[PDB]
From Swiss-Prot:
GO terms for molecular function: aspartic-type endopeptidase activity. It catalyses: Hydrolysis of proteins with specificity similar to that of pepsin A, prefers hydrophobic residues at P1 and P1', but does not cleave 14-Ala-|-Leu-15 in the B chain of insulin or Z-Glu-Tyr. Clots milk. Its EC number is 3.4.23.22. The active site is at residues 35, 199. The chain holds residues 90 to 419 of 419 of the full protein. Belongs to the peptidase A1 family. GO terms for biological process: proteolysis. Keywords: Aspartyl protease, Disulfide bond, Hydrolase, Protease, Signal, Zymogen. Residues 17-328 form the Peptidase A1 domain. Disulfide bonds join 255-290. The lineage of its organism: Eukaryota, Fungi, Dikarya, Ascomycota, Pezizomycotina. This is Endothiapepsin.
């Protein structure tokens, strides 16, 4: 089997991407944030505290003839950005782009933090990191990909995120028309439950490539590119007027600037992030100070190849016995 679903930016800045997911019988379609940095599929639901729902589409398991309460199961998760959610668990039929999993754990939110409430466009998350990170207790549950794997034509899914435009998540096949040149595959460590890999270095604009190992995670659920302070300093030094602002919470730059590109290494290959991808617009409405899309990972504890990086590539998440990551230009 295979699946193919379009993923759409939630706003003009590509702050995140939503992908329609069918849950239950009859289908209830929710727009979920596919997140290769976490491993819970959770949804706004009929059980979510009413004051914490503000425009989201909810899953109502009582209206699904295939929903079954997973007795005794609860979940609770906190994300790198400080947001959190928690609740109980159903199993139900979940389909993504024509690909169907029966008995998928659908984690029903009883509580969500304010940032989820305040984002009316995201109805929940669909985790695509390794199932070892799944928070369901007392019986850990498998991700949608993990459940689908054995049925897939090939045990892979691919992320093809658009810049200010829709893109695609595919399951079970590699669309050879979706990228240019070749896919370069690189080793993954699953030791922390992430799609963790080692970039071979970087360049800023038309500058020389610096060969240096950068361990980080391919994370579709993180907006920006978080890299070591040395790297990030080298980037923003090439933008006149750019500075790190503790009050704003990162590097800012004059909105009048033209941003240089940023290149990262995948083995001997090179992915080029155009400078426009690195502009996340005014820090506040009407401001001429703009927020940068490359930020320091210092104090995160891990480097994150978030959407800013991933959207410049066709990315293969190879879930073979020994997982690997593939990157192609597009």
């Amino acid at each position: 089997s295979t699946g193919s679903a379009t993923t759409t930016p939630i706003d003009s800045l590509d702050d995140a991407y939503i992908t329609p997911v069918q849950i239950g019988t009859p289908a209830q379609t929710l727009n979920l944030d596919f997140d290769t940095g976490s491993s819970d599929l959770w949804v706004f639901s009929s059980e979510t505290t009413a004051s914490e729902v503000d425009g989201q589409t909810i899953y109502t398991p009582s209206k699904s003839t295939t929903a079954k309460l997973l007795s005794g199961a609860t979940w609770s998760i906190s994300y790198g950005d400080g947001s959190s959610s928690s609740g109980d668990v159903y199993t139900d039929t979940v389909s993504v782009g024509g690909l169907t999993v029966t008995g998928q754990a659908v984690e029903s939110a009883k509580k969500v933090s304010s940032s989820f409430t305040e984002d009316s466009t995201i109805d929940g998350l669909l985790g695509l990191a390794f199932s070892t990170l799944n928070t369901v207790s007392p019986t850990q549950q498998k991700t949608f990909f993990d459940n689908a794997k054995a049925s897939l034509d090939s045990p892979v899914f691919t992320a093809d995120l658009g810049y200010h435009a829709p893109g695609t998540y595919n399951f079970g096949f590699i669309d050879t028309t979706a990228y240019t040149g070749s896919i370069t595959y690189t080793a993954v460590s699953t030791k922390q439950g992430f799609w963790e890999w080692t970039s071979t270095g970087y360049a800023v604009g038309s500058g020389t490539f610096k060969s240096t190992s950068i361990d980080g995670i391919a994370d579709t659920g993180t907006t920006l590119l978080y890299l070591p302070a040395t790297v990030v300093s080298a980037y923003w030094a090439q933008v006149s007027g750019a500075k790190s602002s503790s009050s704003v919470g990162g590097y800012v730059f004059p909105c009048s600037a033209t941003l240089p590109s940023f290149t990262f290494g995948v083995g001997s290959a090179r992915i080029v992030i155009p400078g426009d991808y690195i502009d996340f617009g005014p820090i506040s409405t009407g401001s001429s100070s703009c927020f940068g899309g490359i930020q320091s990972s210092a104090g995160i504890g891990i480097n994150i190849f978030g959407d800013v990086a991933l959207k410049a590539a066709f990315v293969v998440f190879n879930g073979a016995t020994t997982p690997t990551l593939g990157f192609a230009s597009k």
